[PDB]
């Protein structure tokens, strides 16, 4: 079975499955955990940075795309660099040509379409990384979940990566609460850090291990690492 | 339009097409090179699967890249022509833009680069060739000898050999070549070269060609006799014991 | 025949102090003998404490300033938010201008 | 999209055989028999019009085609492959010769061009060889009359007379007995009709047989008068009636 | 223009080329060698457009040296001149043509005879006993037409050139700062360092 | 090796399996069609089967108006059929532009056959699983029927039939022509030629037809058109008053 | 032998293209969606599974517009559906630029048709993993279409695809019989909402969100618009009511 | 994708051999034998025509001996059609050289060029090699009479006498036995015919099964002449040498 | 066969993983960063005594403030070095300044995944991943002394100390215990020499091993054999002292 239909992205299995895409999705599950959640005034990204040795640094997981948009990654870092870069350009094009800030919803559509092309042609391979996009545009705060299959979804909160299921259940429970944490960034962050620690197991979030990002009403997308995240540990 | 990846990694980390390219070199006639104190000598063995050839016109195993540098090889003859031509063109281009002929290391690095490129470009197979490049840098008198292989890796040697039975002749050289006192003479250098070849050629006056390279574009190939004379004097060193 | 250039007038002035610098410019924009605007900003804050003004053919001046501001933005993206030094902006601008040497 | 088949589909096997060419030859063997006989003052090529249904109009399907006014062709094997080869042959006779020298090419050279086209389908990327063998007959001032055979490999050879397809072995043998270097065109036509009769199962007449000749110039088939040096095509397809008249003297 | 002269005597070809390089109002150099050795028995002199001149010469030199290494042989003068003619003929119909005129003097070791080829920027080639490019010919061809002989010695050839140069230094408007003379024969190429007063 | 059955290269027996399988695809629709030539017209008839009640019957057709003068009926899956129809229309329009006159039925047939031959020889292109029957009243040849298949083959016919029960229709037609001794229906009106066609369709298939079980196309001097359900009913009525 | 199903444009011994058939499986595994043709327009509706409380309601729109008069909805691999609509839009823009008039539904149908069919011609590409229902109003009426992964398509009175396609088709068939004179846009909308609720039983495990859109000469001036607010609730109730 | 049907014509075997080259050589070994013998005053080329019939027009036939220059010729062993492709490019290369330098092309330079073309099909492009082996007979004013051989691999070598095609082993042994450096063209002609005569897989060696050619510098002139013998001329030389 | 950019059922790119296996067979390379500079050391590993060891170049200069060591298929590293040198020099031409070490590394890593037979994303013409790993060491005013590990996967990590090559697992364990935020350049040198000595098959001497460092003051320098010989001697002495 599978073995005969998983040679490339241009082959459908007898049950209508695309294995190369499913394998790419597996690289996400092996990636470190990251969480995202939003209220009506702010959107937050929380990520657990993974290190190789105790002599190495913890690889960044959050990338800024514009003053009002950013994302967190889980899976192949290089693919996240390619995709975030494409998004940086799309945000750029929108500003230069129409003097307009790119709608988060539109960014999701562009990402979906870019990923899809890599699941229907020969020679190419699907992107092997998951992305959580947050932003504040003309319709408020937003959170998107991107999957290499090309599926992009808008949520109030979510999580991807290993053991991501813990944080996801916690958020699906805390919903009514954090969705109302308006005009209070520090609270939304704490709400996110609490969600991510629901997927811990190995260790506990430290200072050079935690990474947070926020965007909102009067808050440009900014990234907090190290000492700057101490007050949340 | 053809761009299939022919040279790729296998589970154990090897690139079989490059590895098999080396096998083609092991099958090629033997070639050796030894550097003296004021010269470099290149020796090659001549096959005998068929004999009735016209030596005047049959392409020789040692090629001049420029008036001060030569190249010999082991492996597929046809493939070597491609590298030799490219090297010759690069040598003229270098004189044209830098107003100075190439150094031996530069020429080697160039040939090696071409070989490496053919190990990771689509639609092509690696060169089934290993080379020995020798000569003297412009206005320099220090001898130079380098070797390149299919992978594109290169380095300099006091003496070295490639091709069939190169294992044997290398041993002879490792325990017959003293870095403390390199063959201080064109003669004793050509002698060490002929000796090492006899270890594998099995009596072949006409199966052994030699080329001597000295400073300032002084390159010349010995004739059968000149060589035959070296063989004779050497078979005596043995019998005189 | 079509002439790709125009002249919008205007004058700008830059003076460097010991620990400060100023860049001034009139706000009038013109075409031949008419005034297009009495207030059309010609000097801009480009970020990283750099002010710029490209005077002459306004359309070209706008394109250049726009392209430089975008250059600053990408400089941050590609070099971990490093601040673009004034000497570095100057060199960058040389390549922007020389890119259209013809 | 984009043809990504840039590699050969015909390659050498360990025994030295080129499989695809051998297989194309096998397709030629299953084809209806066709033949050609060279006389002292002309050439005849013929084949059977194996109609694929009585409702089909066998005349709308020509197995014998004019390539130039003095050169014709016939085949055995895959009819559709033949059809496009004829289109290409007619065109190359112009692009590689008439538009350069202002005259039609001599038989051997046009044959040479066709052969080249076929050889390329044997090595070029992404294609299979043509599944046909051709018999090309013609005339030109300096070589006189000639007859050639072109196989799927691109190889071609001149003949005094020969046959290809289904019963080529038996037909070649029958031709070796009746051929001599003194035959007149009418004699060759007669020999052609006799040879073809052994290969045909059912009806044998001017409506089931297709035959053409390269003989004298036909000023009546030129289309205009006024230029002495222009005498007309040497290629002529016999009519159903002309064939029957000769079948009675069979 | 610059002075480019050539003359084929009994057993050699002599090439004479002016030493000045003038740009506008100033003579920038007075020891310019307007020649390139293409092979041990083939020499080429050139004059014309500022940059194209040397770029063309050096390009031709590179190609001939490449041919020499690849074949371990030396192309005959006639072969080299034909190669040079084709290059110039291609150039005249390109986007930006090489505006270069040349003289090719070589000694054919197989025939044992000296040869002189004159080729202009259009690819116009002709073989002659003596030649010149530019305005020089206007004063020298009548001189040589008068004093030239096929059996002249290399020495008689040099006295003939001296005569040509004196006429040029008398009637031509520009100061070309003398000439550099080179001899091409069965032994190769040598430069007559003593012509500033021979 | 076994791949000589996936792409269009010869098999050891000199066969092209992919072409043979494409021929198999032409019967996937389980529809039969036939064409006959009148004195000065050409008729094509094809069964029409609309199983699903949710389908808009008016959009279910296998007959296409290629040009003002050429009609085409297809036997094979509709998507490959539409691919062929679009290409044929483009080819016909282009021919008129470049050569100044209407593309003849037999010429368009040859052109489409050549295109099919190419899919038969080049590996990256697959054959279209269809058989195309072209009809018209050519200005030089008169009533015309030319049919092409996935092998690149094409020929002209006095009459023809295509489909699962092609053979029964063909022999029925052959028998009629052995009898009449002429290569066409000797009728002045196209209406009677349509009736003859439907009549023999019924006899050979042993089935009765309602106005929605058929599809009809007619070719006359300077025009090819298709009949409406009602024009067909009028035809069915007339044949009923004879039996 | 075997292996006929490993490469996209290969004909199997029985004349089929297995890769296209496998694409169909991806479609049947998808959400259910439908289309209803009324007396002067068309209505589209689709089932949107609620994976979790986290999905912001009414935010993940699935129905798409082409030009200003065409609606498209699909079941299967959502990204493939978008890809197809992007092409559809370029196709519509191209037609308007050259001919001025907005593209006729039948013409648009073939444009999508030829493109989808093209993806069954080579082994270098994969067939589309979606079935699409689209239509709108043009110079001469309303038109509803459904396009399969093979590039096959026809005009319809009603159409359905996806998980609960059978239930939907049964419901659509009843309507066709009980309304030979034609359904009204207003009625079609409610009827559409009902059919989706009934067809949701083939996926009753997860909760879902309803989405409807329509294009009617009288109700929307022939432009494609989404059913929102009051008209939407009124339709949801009509369904919730007849589900019991 | 396409990768599935790619034979990979240009890869090494674990032993460092080129499959396609080795198989093309195997193909060559079944072709009519071709012999080349170089003498002091000329060169001889002789080849056996593989397969023949009574009806084969031998006068208008050429399948093994081709004129490349007025001074260079080749004998062919292998696929005739592949050979014509290479022969034509060689004829072009020769004319290009003459146009550039106004001198006929040196034999080795033309041979090297053709060999390089063959080598290319061996390292890139994914196409099958040419199934051809050539024996070149030519003359130039630098090396005089020359004899070369090239095969599918692109390797070429020079000889005093050589054979290609069928039974080269047996033929090479015979040549090595009776060849002598001081030979003369007429001796060579006889040696060539005798050798072919003993290696033929046929009953007897008749004129209709041969092609013959010589490159001599006819003393009464001073230039080089290529003579491609006519049927009658072969029949004659066959009787004289005592083979009747 | 199987595409060069195919995913395994575990979500890994076959060719990249197999690439890592080739790097494990390469000569060892070690790098150590201190507040006084960064040290880079490699195992020459000549394959025969006739091979002139100094012609073995496994430590190369990228720019005055950046150097690097390689391990694995060393021939594959040339185009990477060429790209890095060009990127550094080009950055200086465009901005009149030194390129940051991290930026230079990111640029080299951008080349990594540019392989395939026709991957839809740009024009990645390179048939296979690089079969070599690199240690990039340098200094810039913003982040000081740095050490990076660049792999054929395109990912790069910053390390305080790192070993790559045949003896990496062993050497890395050793570095884990020996490294501390206050090592001096001298300590680092000896430390690199020591670890190389433990993992090398041959007895470490100034001919089969090579050292180098990069300091803000003098830039990247490759220690000549005489200087390293002394450091070898000094190391033997301190080890034999207990």
PDB file of N, CA, C and O in Angstrom, chain A residues 28-57:
ATOM      1  N   UNK A  28       5.939  18.708  11.473  1.00  0.00           N
ATOM      2  CA  UNK A  28       5.395  19.755  12.323  1.00  0.00           C
ATOM      3  C   UNK A  28       5.222  19.201  13.724  1.00  0.00           C
ATOM      4  O   UNK A  28       5.616  19.836  14.703  1.00  0.00           O
ATOM      5  N   UNK A  29       4.634  18.008  13.808  1.00  0.00           N
ATOM      6  CA  UNK A  29       4.414  17.347  15.090  1.00  0.00           C
ATOM      7  C   UNK A  29       5.716  17.066  15.833  1.00  0.00           C
ATOM      8  O   UNK A  29       5.716  16.941  17.053  1.00  0.00           O
ATOM      9  N   UNK A  30       6.820  16.964  15.100  1.00  0.00           N
ATOM     10  CA  UNK A  30       8.121  16.719  15.707  1.00  0.00           C
ATOM     11  C   UNK A  30       8.753  18.055  16.117  1.00  0.00           C
ATOM     12  O   UNK A  30       9.781  18.090  16.790  1.00  0.00           O
ATOM     13  N   UNK A  31       8.129  19.157  15.711  1.00  0.00           N
ATOM     14  CA  UNK A  31       8.660  20.466  16.047  1.00  0.00           C
ATOM     15  C   UNK A  31       8.291  20.902  17.454  1.00  0.00           C
ATOM     16  O   UNK A  31       7.343  20.378  18.044  1.00  0.00           O
ATOM     17  N   UNK A  32       9.042  21.856  17.996  1.00  0.00           N
ATOM     18  CA  UNK A  32       8.773  22.357  19.339  1.00  0.00           C
ATOM     19  C   UNK A  32       7.422  23.073  19.392  1.00  0.00           C
ATOM     20  O   UNK A  32       6.975  23.647  18.397  1.00  0.00           O
ATOM     21  N   UNK A  33       6.780  23.055  20.558  1.00  0.00           N
ATOM     22  CA  UNK A  33       5.459  23.665  20.708  1.00  0.00           C
ATOM     23  C   UNK A  33       5.400  25.196  20.695  1.00  0.00           C
ATOM     24  O   UNK A  33       6.313  25.883  21.169  1.00  0.00           O
ATOM     25  N   UNK A  34       4.310  25.713  20.135  1.00  0.00           N
ATOM     26  CA  UNK A  34       4.066  27.147  20.077  1.00  0.00           C
ATOM     27  C   UNK A  34       2.559  27.388  20.200  1.00  0.00           C
ATOM     28  O   UNK A  34       1.750  26.609  19.683  1.00  0.00           O
ATOM     29  N   UNK A  35       2.190  28.459  20.898  1.00  0.00           N
ATOM     30  CA  UNK A  35       0.782  28.790  21.117  1.00  0.00           C
ATOM     31  C   UNK A  35       0.407  30.185  20.624  1.00  0.00           C
ATOM     32  O   UNK A  35       1.240  31.096  20.586  1.00  0.00           O
ATOM     33  N   UNK A  36      -0.864  30.342  20.264  1.00  0.00           N
ATOM     34  CA  UNK A  36      -1.356  31.625  19.803  1.00  0.00           C
ATOM     35  C   UNK A  36      -2.766  31.846  20.313  1.00  0.00           C
ATOM     36  O   UNK A  36      -3.564  30.911  20.373  1.00  0.00           O
ATOM     37  N   UNK A  37      -3.073  33.082  20.696  1.00  0.00           N
ATOM     38  CA  UNK A  37      -4.404  33.420  21.194  1.00  0.00           C
ATOM     39  C   UNK A  37      -4.627  34.924  21.074  1.00  0.00           C
ATOM     40  O   UNK A  37      -3.669  35.707  21.083  1.00  0.00           O
ATOM     41  N   UNK A  38      -5.889  35.328  20.976  1.00  0.00           N
ATOM     42  CA  UNK A  38      -6.200  36.746  20.837  1.00  0.00           C
ATOM     43  C   UNK A  38      -7.457  37.175  21.588  1.00  0.00           C
ATOM     44  O   UNK A  38      -8.317  36.356  21.920  1.00  0.00           O
ATOM     45  N   UNK A  39      -7.552  38.475  21.844  1.00  0.00           N
ATOM     46  CA  UNK A  39      -8.720  39.055  22.488  1.00  0.00           C
ATOM     47  C   UNK A  39      -9.327  39.904  21.372  1.00  0.00           C
ATOM     48  O   UNK A  39      -9.299  39.503  20.207  1.00  0.00           O
ATOM     49  N   UNK A  40      -9.868  41.068  21.712  1.00  0.00           N
ATOM     50  CA  UNK A  40     -10.440  41.947  20.702  1.00  0.00           C
ATOM     51  C   UNK A  40      -9.498  43.120  20.476  1.00  0.00           C
ATOM     52  O   UNK A  40      -9.686  43.906  19.549  1.00  0.00           O
ATOM     53  N   UNK A  41      -8.474  43.220  21.319  1.00  0.00           N
ATOM     54  CA  UNK A  41      -7.513  44.315  21.226  1.00  0.00           C
ATOM     55  C   UNK A  41      -6.067  43.890  20.953  1.00  0.00           C
ATOM     56  O   UNK A  41      -5.277  44.682  20.426  1.00  0.00           O
ATOM     57  N   UNK A  42      -5.714  42.658  21.323  1.00  0.00           N
ATOM     58  CA  UNK A  42      -4.358  42.148  21.096  1.00  0.00           C
ATOM     59  C   UNK A  42      -4.341  40.687  20.646  1.00  0.00           C
ATOM     60  O   UNK A  42      -5.308  39.951  20.830  1.00  0.00           O
ATOM     61  N   UNK A  43      -3.221  40.289  20.055  1.00  0.00           N
ATOM     62  CA  UNK A  43      -3.011  38.927  19.583  1.00  0.00           C
ATOM     63  C   UNK A  43      -1.649  38.546  20.133  1.00  0.00           C
ATOM     64  O   UNK A  43      -0.719  39.361  20.125  1.00  0.00           O
ATOM     65  N   UNK A  44      -1.528  37.315  20.615  1.00  0.00           N
ATOM     66  CA  UNK A  44      -0.270  36.883  21.198  1.00  0.00           C
ATOM     67  C   UNK A  44       0.257  35.548  20.704  1.00  0.00           C
ATOM     68  O   UNK A  44      -0.501  34.617  20.436  1.00  0.00           O
ATOM     69  N   UNK A  45       1.578  35.482  20.594  1.00  0.00           N
ATOM     70  CA  UNK A  45       2.267  34.269  20.194  1.00  0.00           C
ATOM     71  C   UNK A  45       3.203  33.915  21.339  1.00  0.00           C
ATOM     72  O   UNK A  45       3.893  34.789  21.878  1.00  0.00           O
ATOM     73  N   UNK A  46       3.211  32.641  21.718  1.00  0.00           N
ATOM     74  CA  UNK A  46       4.084  32.149  22.779  1.00  0.00           C
ATOM     75  C   UNK A  46       4.751  30.916  22.197  1.00  0.00           C
ATOM     76  O   UNK A  46       4.083  30.040  21.644  1.00  0.00           O
ATOM     77  N   UNK A  47       6.066  30.843  22.308  1.00  0.00           N
ATOM     78  CA  UNK A  47       6.759  29.696  21.759  1.00  0.00           C
ATOM     79  C   UNK A  47       7.862  29.176  22.666  1.00  0.00           C
ATOM     80  O   UNK A  47       8.507  29.941  23.387  1.00  0.00           O
ATOM     81  N   UNK A  48       8.057  27.860  22.623  1.00  0.00           N
ATOM     82  CA  UNK A  48       9.090  27.189  23.403  1.00  0.00           C
ATOM     83  C   UNK A  48      10.276  26.970  22.466  1.00  0.00           C
ATOM     84  O   UNK A  48      10.174  26.224  21.492  1.00  0.00           O
ATOM     85  N   UNK A  49      11.392  27.641  22.738  1.00  0.00           N
ATOM     86  CA  UNK A  49      12.570  27.494  21.890  1.00  0.00           C
ATOM     87  C   UNK A  49      13.374  26.241  22.251  1.00  0.00           C
ATOM     88  O   UNK A  49      13.646  25.972  23.417  1.00  0.00           O
ATOM     89  N   UNK A  50      13.752  25.480  21.234  1.00  0.00           N
ATOM     90  CA  UNK A  50      14.504  24.247  21.424  1.00  0.00           C
ATOM     91  C   UNK A  50      15.994  24.438  21.144  1.00  0.00           C
ATOM     92  O   UNK A  50      16.376  25.188  20.250  1.00  0.00           O
ATOM     93  N   UNK A  51      16.836  23.761  21.913  1.00  0.00           N
ATOM     94  CA  UNK A  51      18.282  23.858  21.726  1.00  0.00           C
ATOM     95  C   UNK A  51      18.862  22.484  21.377  1.00  0.00           C
ATOM     96  O   UNK A  51      18.233  21.453  21.647  1.00  0.00           O
ATOM     97  N   UNK A  52      20.046  22.470  20.767  1.00  0.00           N
ATOM     98  CA  UNK A  52      20.706  21.218  20.391  1.00  0.00           C
ATOM     99  C   UNK A  52      21.482  20.637  21.584  1.00  0.00           C
ATOM    100  O   UNK A  52      21.145  19.568  22.097  1.00  0.00           O
ATOM    101  N   UNK A  53      22.527  21.353  22.005  1.00  0.00           N
ATOM    102  CA  UNK A  53      23.367  20.979  23.149  1.00  0.00           C
ATOM    103  C   UNK A  53      23.114  22.035  24.211  1.00  0.00           C
ATOM    104  O   UNK A  53      22.329  22.962  24.007  1.00  0.00           O
ATOM    105  N   UNK A  54      23.790  21.902  25.343  1.00  0.00           N
ATOM    106  CA  UNK A  54      23.648  22.893  26.392  1.00  0.00           C
ATOM    107  C   UNK A  54      24.701  23.957  26.098  1.00  0.00           C
ATOM    108  O   UNK A  54      24.879  24.918  26.847  1.00  0.00           O
ATOM    109  N   UNK A  55      25.388  23.769  24.973  1.00  0.00           N
ATOM    110  CA  UNK A  55      26.413  24.697  24.515  1.00  0.00           C
ATOM    111  C   UNK A  55      25.902  25.519  23.327  1.00  0.00           C
ATOM    112  O   UNK A  55      26.586  26.434  22.858  1.00  0.00           O
ATOM    113  N   UNK A  56      24.700  25.188  22.851  1.00  0.00           N
ATOM    114  CA  UNK A  56      24.099  25.884  21.713  1.00  0.00           C
ATOM    115  C   UNK A  56      23.022  26.868  22.141  1.00  0.00           C
ATOM    116  O   UNK A  56      22.583  26.882  23.291  1.00  0.00           O
ATOM    117  N   UNK A  57      22.599  27.692  21.193  1.00  0.00           N
ATOM    118  CA  UNK A  57      21.559  28.675  21.436  1.00  0.00           C
ATOM    119  C   UNK A  57      20.213  27.993  21.210  1.00  0.00           C
ATOM    120  O   UNK A  57      20.158  26.858  20.727  1.00  0.00           O
TER     121      UNK A  57
END
